[PDB]
Amino acid sequence: GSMAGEDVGAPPDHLWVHQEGIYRDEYQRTWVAVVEEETSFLRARVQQIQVPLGDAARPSHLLTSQLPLMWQLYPEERYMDNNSRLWQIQHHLMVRGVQELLLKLLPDDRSPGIHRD
């Protein structure tokens, strides 16, 4: 009988990198992917904010060359690129009226095998 707040509505089922460290949602929502190389992994902090899309090349891919040209929200709780990798949604929430989606890329999670039966 308190009535908790409310969590984000829904993440970007898909993202389209238009600017270095930026991505476009499927609802005209710009994102800011802050490629943050992990100690031993890849993290692309996608922050949702209102910013004008400047250029439209592949500077981030040329510079960083980590984030895909498009993400595809897959089942479970991860984002599947179009290159040939699956990024794990490290965390997705909203802060200061901004949606910060954390994407973690791994070296193709070792194929699962039926261990014992």
UniProtKB/Swiss-Prot annotation:
Protein's UniProt keywords contain Acetylation: no
GO term, biological process aspect, one: intracellular signal transduction
One Pfam family hit: TCL1_MTCP1
UniProt KW keywords: Chromosomal rearrangement, Proto-oncogene
GO molecular function, one term: protein serine/threonine kinase activator activity
InterPro entries found in the cross-reference section: TCL1_MTCP1 (IPR004832), TCL1_MTCP1_sf (IPR036672)
Gene3D superfamilies: TCL1/MTCP1
Tissue: Not found at a significant level in any tissue.
Subunit structure, interactors included: Interacts with AKT1 and AKT2 (via PH domain). Does not interact with AKT3.
Free-text function comment from the UniProt entry: Enhances the phosphorylation and activation of AKT1 and AKT2.
Family indicated by similarity: Belongs to the TCL1 family.
Pathological association: Detected in T-cell leukemia bearing a t(X;14) translocation. Plays a key role in T-cell prolymphocytic leukemia.
Name this polypeptide is given: Protein p13 MTCP-1
Source organism: Homo sapiens (Human)
Organism placement in taxonomy: Eukaryota, Metazoa, Chordata, Craniata, Vertebrata
Gene this protein is translated from: MTCP1
